[PDB]
């Protein structure tokens, strides 16, 4: 999702919080959007 790595442990163990915050925020945004999409699809299928 634009971050340096897709694993939170790598970012935590490689970067200090002040600069790792941006990568963690990008990962959070991407994963939150994916989860919201999944929940919406599940709601529609549950209605079906």
């Amino acid at each position: 999702f634009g971050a340096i790595s897709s694993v939170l442990n790598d970012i935590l163990s490689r970067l200090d919080p002040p600069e790792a915050e941006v990568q963690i925020d990008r990962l959070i945004t991407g994963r939150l959007q994916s989860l919201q999409t999944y929940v919406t699809q599940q709601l529609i299928r549950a209605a079906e």
Partner: protein, 49 residues
């Protein structure tokens, strides 16, 4: 042999040395006052150890 050497190559002919098969202590390098510039990109220096 790289930091405490006596010869440094020119800028357009910069000298590259490969480091492998050993253990590196970056903490002593970072905490020393001999260096007037120590900046790390993609990693933080304090975690290099």
């Amino acid at each position: 042999e790289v930091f405490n050497a006596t010869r440094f190559a020119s800028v357009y002919a910069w000298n590259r040395k490969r480091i492998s098969n050993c253990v590196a202590d970056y903490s002593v390098l970072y905490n020393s006052a001999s260096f007037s510039t120590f900046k790390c990109y993609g990693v933080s220096p304090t975690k290099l150890n």
